[PDB]
Ligand binder design. Structure first.
Ligand SMILES: CC1(C)[C@@H](OC(=O)CCC(=O)O)CC[C@]2(C)[C@H]3C(=O)C=C4[C@@H]5C[C@@](C)(C(=O)O)CC[C@]5(C)CC[C@@]4(C)[C@]3(C)CC[C@@H]12
Lengths: 325, 329, 329, 327, 328, 323
């Protein structure tokens, strides 16, 4: 596992919450699976059974392989808990890989989805706030010497449409279902007695059915089941911690706060209306991304400064505003 | 599987191709290759194709000769005695190779499309985008002059593409051959799953040449095709993937049933753009170009301004050219 | 392979050559190359290509020596006694190498082309492109002045190219040598496939030198040329690919029939452009240059505008000079 | 190793620098240690051996080594004086190391994602205001040689109220220090292990191997490379015992802040001669920290520094020196 | 072999050298290199290069020691009992190394012509190219003004190069060294293939040191040079390729014969250019200069224009001054 | 060594501090990699001759138990002591740690030094080029402010020593690590090279009262000689590299050939070099003179200085000729 080391070295020298969730739900299982087959620890193939010393070297290899393949054929298997334990033991990494790919899916669905209207409208609302700020500045400057609620009308329009909000909520909900299923499964793969590996096999079929030099049966054990157990426990912890994060992300209206337009509501060139709260609509998601990327607008910083000044109350809107420039 | 690890790590931290179709190609091409790689994992695939449990009296190199001779004898159908038939063994020896072949066959349509079908539609999209930007600019300049040629060229090219069917035929052909390949490989794989899983534990006896009359040789060897259950579970997964992708491929095939909002309606509020969208209901490049417009319309910011105007008109607050002047695009 | 497929997967997420010929080179190079790669696949290549089932009394390293000596003896024809003959031994002992040599031979003609005649075609294409753009500019300026030299230069270049076949000779020669290569390789591969499939299970007796009158040696060992089955499957695959590819090469050879839909008439709607395309049945560099112009005609914006105008004139909605001024090129 | 070799070869060929180096060490030391733990030269082979009787077959002994090595999970089964806990720790020592390493690496990412953008934007804005103020002052001095509101100072007073970013940075550093504490505790614990668990008795006598007779009772089963783990863990423990006070001093926000840059802007008539930015658990302090950090990025900051150093000599008049600057 | 496989796959995904010579160097480089890489192909390479079937009494490591001892004993000519001699075995061992040496020797003269004779070539090229461009521009401006100095500069440079025989000597030398190289290498290749192919099997007797009087040792071991037939087949392929390439080398040597299709004659229709082809085969650096002029003259747009005008004058329907004015 | 060979082949087809860092980083890394090479690593670390009666895997367990016993001081029987066994066990690891430690100060210093040095250099270059252009304009006007700003910044850095202190600290910790690792390397070589031939007796646990086991096996620590030769090579490399850092230490003494003099002949520049004899950032910043080639105007000033060196022409006349 030197490739992960190099990934960190180049590390050394979409909502942020969703980005972090993707990061966790991606690395934890992927890094886990890479760790399981890590060359230093990937020593051993989990077929050990010590067939009688009379069995030749290659005879022993055949025993090991025939059992390892017989993990599927239930009739060949003589197990206490059942074959499905053995199945889980064999595909445990493959199962982890499938779960992880499934979890990475929804973010990819969003990425190729790109939330087209959402990103374009983000750029649009940015340009609109910028133009409104420039217009207010020029108006105050002339005072020292159209008019349609464009962004406000766009917001009213978003107040009807929730299609993108439906997309966001569906992505989050698919994420939650994924992690819930994976956590249940991973606890199940940790719900093992951990005794299933040491099971008994007898490859006495074919010409080996009536063969005599063969022993009655072989006791093989599935190694690294303890390792698989430990890694499943780690991933289960990670996901039992991650699920509340997905839950909190699911409550977007409960999260949409700290009105950014509140400062721009002090603008005469802007409609005096926050009008952004309490809705299962793309208004909420657009407002969330607006709070997310709102620092990117220099005028947003200026508006925060003016809002603080009004909180300072030393100056008035017009004088200090025109002074801002 | 360090390849997928690095892919995800970098994943951690014009279109000229349909997003649905791009993702379908991506999945249906990788998932088979992905499964093949995951099985070709030496940690997963450590041993040979099949062991034989030869007599202990046989030498280690003798055991190797037995193993290899049977594993090669899977081809000679007369060589081994199996109830299922030779085709099972053949499939088992060629399961990964056949998987790779199907994957290459699936990669072929996107490649051919990009080589031949794509560039012309790309140039067409570029021309349409230039026409749209120029028309929006001209309408905005007229609106500005009011606040202070004339040939429907883009509409003409649209009416022409309404006759043009070649490109639509090419796209539909790529998608259809794709779906056909998906169905064929799906049947093949499901049959590969249909394998009773008993062929693996077959019997071979290499008694050719002097080994025909050999004495120290036993009667025969019990060889067991390893990774038979592995290949079968992979076949199940791949068949699932393909039975799920096929409906997506079919819906992608339906161009008239794509049922996309008329992007021209956003430019239909232009004075400089005649009021006629008329882009649907034809087994021609008409519908395909309409779909590509619905696709790459985000690449045109003027399309974004038109959509903003459309939303404003949905609010019904103001008048159209006055709002255009208010936009000053 | 593992990493070959990994790079292939991460690949996803002026023509100066015949696109058809480009794809032909691609297939005819990849099929053998990917096949040879499979011949060195870890899952496919299980180990050495020979196994001999020596007596168990023979020591381990003794068994290795026997295997190797028989393997080298596949060349020494008097040593190995096979009912088929030595030539099969030659073949399925160097079949991969032979495939690689054939693939290199197949990549040779396109390399010689791209090195020798390709820059000539690039210069000719750039020159014709400049000529067409200049004609479009002059026509647009004259149409605008109406709204307010003249020598057949491109036509002269066309008449000149209509005489010489030198570049056409080069292109046809590359294609024809390629086709000969395809036919020879196909015959070869079919031959190698058309093998007993049993000759591999030959018998060797390395009783040379002191081993001639040696006693502990068996009279002979029944040795097997492993992987012959997979070699045969791969040869069949490649032969099928080539039987599918050859007619494409033939169609490439037929250049006149390949020459179709001359765009010289898409500029013939210009008065400052000759009304005589004179662009058919030219068994000379004419045909090749015209084909490459048909290929890269999309790159010229004026070609796009002229195509729009040609469609409009087919649609019959606008006068030629009026619509020309309206497009305002 | 090899990837490490390439990293060193290219080596041979906005975030707090102290924090950057802290994260860098806290990542590389365990990562490099783990990589060495699988070094082809260092890692010599399997981690467990028990010298089963020669009567046991080769592959038989292989099965023994394997089943024993796995039996470490089987708590009741194994025969050790220390218990299943130390052998367990050795069973996944590198796993624990990697968990701790990724855990330590997370908070820097959370920072470089959450507090990074706001601080970056605010710093760009403050530097831009500084540059515009310097331009305005030089221009006014030039015109004399022939608004006026504390805008950036207003933003400073504003940040002096909010401590949200300060809270984020402090929490990042604090969680990181907590990780260092717990990890160093664990590491010393693992090294504290008496190197006795390595050698112990293993008896894979379960099932038909329980009532099997050809099997001996047990083997003397030797966990391997435990000494290597001990030495590298000691190295890491020393590294982290050295690093923890660095994290502490980093957590010292009012004390790390020194030499207020605002004095350089305090040489301005057009910009208030007032730092008024220190001594507070507010985002003001961290903003001042980053101002001191990337103030070298501001060329006008360099001009102010040279001018202030000259005025320390007292050579020329401040307006005269400004006019001579002609920046 | 997946390295070169992916290399050629992504292959599918000024000149300062003669195209013919470029192809010669390319082939003469790849064929031996490709063969060598084939020799170390894991599918192709079966394993160790020698095997001798020591008695089963000899232990495993004993057998390995025998194999290696003989393998090195191919050098000690007395220790090896060879009817053909030791030099065959010598050739067998370094056979790849021999091919690698031949390959490096094949790549050297291309490198010499690459860096050496880069300055003169590029200088003459850029200079004569700018000169032709200026002559075309001047003739065009002259026709435009007439319808409305005087020094044969590049012609003078050609006259000067007529005396020059330095770069001509260098090119001839690069070709000649290459020809000698390929000739000697092909002689060697046949000689290697000339070998009996039964010499590959030879007897070794490791009775040195305490093995001189050792007892458990047999008298000898009969060991075989493995994969010698493969080296033989490779030498066959290389010998065929080089017997094919050598005549191409000779053709490249014949520079004056190859010098054809006078381009300055196409420039001889220029007013600002004197009527002097000045293209005579001789022991002059101009011939190669003329050769590369023919090579990269396609890079000259005005060359294409002049060729068009030349076809027009061959049509004989347009006046040279009138058509020149028409050129625009 | 295929990767490094390809790297040098594609290579084939304070600067002093940079080179010292490069060498002192690669030589240990190069040597450790050389040992890491399996071509050099012809065998496992210890192959130690158990009895033939011991099974293959039994011998494996012996080699493993002894190789682990290289730490357990009671377990092994050696005259030289355990510390030899320790050193031999982690000699590669020791090399790697020393190399990382030696690469650290370059990273830390360059990090600290990057902004300060680059900004001061850019500002000084701007000031010098401005004074040069101004003198050129004055000469051109004669053919037809007044503050020593760069001189002020120079005198300022002549006061502050913090950055020079940082440079000295980087160099000093560097020399300290060099000396420590050099003594260590000679020491590991100083080893009598006899410890490898130690005996181990794995009679622990049931092996205490086990009987089929021999009392012990005389086991050998392999690659001791290779590691020793590597230590000798690296130690000589460091004994050669250290006096370079030593000369670097006397940097004020090392400061020579004042570059400011060529700028001192300007009219727009006061005739005063004033750059020597200080434990301050002055000489450090002067070590300016390092990358001073980037200023074409500096090249012109040097040319004018060389012209006046012969005394052939007047300074302003030839200066205006230069323009
Ligand atoms: C090289 C490796 C280790 C291995 O190679 C690998 O798997 C990779 C690791 C490596 O290459 O070292 C392949 C198996 C093998 C070649 C192996 C073999 O074939 C058969 C035996 C026999 C087993 C035995 C005791 C019996 O089984 O009764 C009878 C005596 C005898 C001859 C002892 C030695 C070994 C164990 C022998 C020759 C030692 C070398 C060994």
């Amino acid at each position: 596992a030197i490739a992960q080391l190099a990934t960190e070295y180049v590390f050394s020298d979409e909502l942020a919450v969703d980005k972090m969730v993707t990061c966790i739900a991606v690395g934890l299982p992927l890094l886990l699976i890479s760790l399981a087959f890590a060359q230093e620890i990937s020593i051993g193939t989990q077929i050990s059974c010590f067939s009688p010393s009379s069995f030749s070297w290659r005879q022993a290899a055949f025993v090991d392989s025939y059992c390892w393949a017989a993990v599927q054929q239930k009739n060949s298997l003589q197990s206490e808990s059942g074959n499905l334990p053995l199945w889980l033991h064999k595909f445990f990494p493959y199962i982890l890989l499938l779960f992880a790919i499934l979890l990475y899916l929804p973010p990819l669905f969003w990425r190729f989805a790109a939330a087209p209207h959402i990103c374009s409208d983000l750029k649009f609302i940015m340009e609109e706030l910028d133009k409104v700020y420039n217009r207010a500045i020029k108006a105050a400057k002339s005072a020292r010497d159209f008019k349609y609620p464009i962004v406000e009308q766009y917001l009213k329009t978003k107040k009807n449409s929730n299609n993108l909000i439906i997309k966001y909520i569906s992505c989050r909900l698919l994420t939650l279902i994924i992690i819930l299923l994976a956590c249940i499964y991973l606890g199940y793969y940790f719900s093992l007695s951990s005794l299933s590996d040491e099971f008994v096999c007898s490859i006495k079929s074919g010409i080996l059915r009536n063969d005599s030099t063969v022993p009655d049966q072989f006791q093989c054990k599935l190694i690294a089941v303890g390792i698989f157990q430990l890694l499943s426990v780690i991933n289960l912890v990670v996901y039992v911690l991650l699920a509340p994060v997905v839950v909190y992300t699911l409550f977007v209206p409960f999260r949409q706060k700290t009105d950014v337009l509140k400062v721009y509501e002090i603008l005469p060139t802007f409609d005096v209306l926050h009008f952004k709260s309490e809705g299962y609509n793309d208004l909420s998601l657009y407002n969330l991304f607006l709070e997310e990327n709102i620092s990117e607008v220099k005028s947003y910083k200026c508006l925060k400064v003016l809002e603080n000044i009004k909180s300072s109350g030393q100056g008035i809107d017009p004088m200090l505003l025109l002074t801002n420039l």
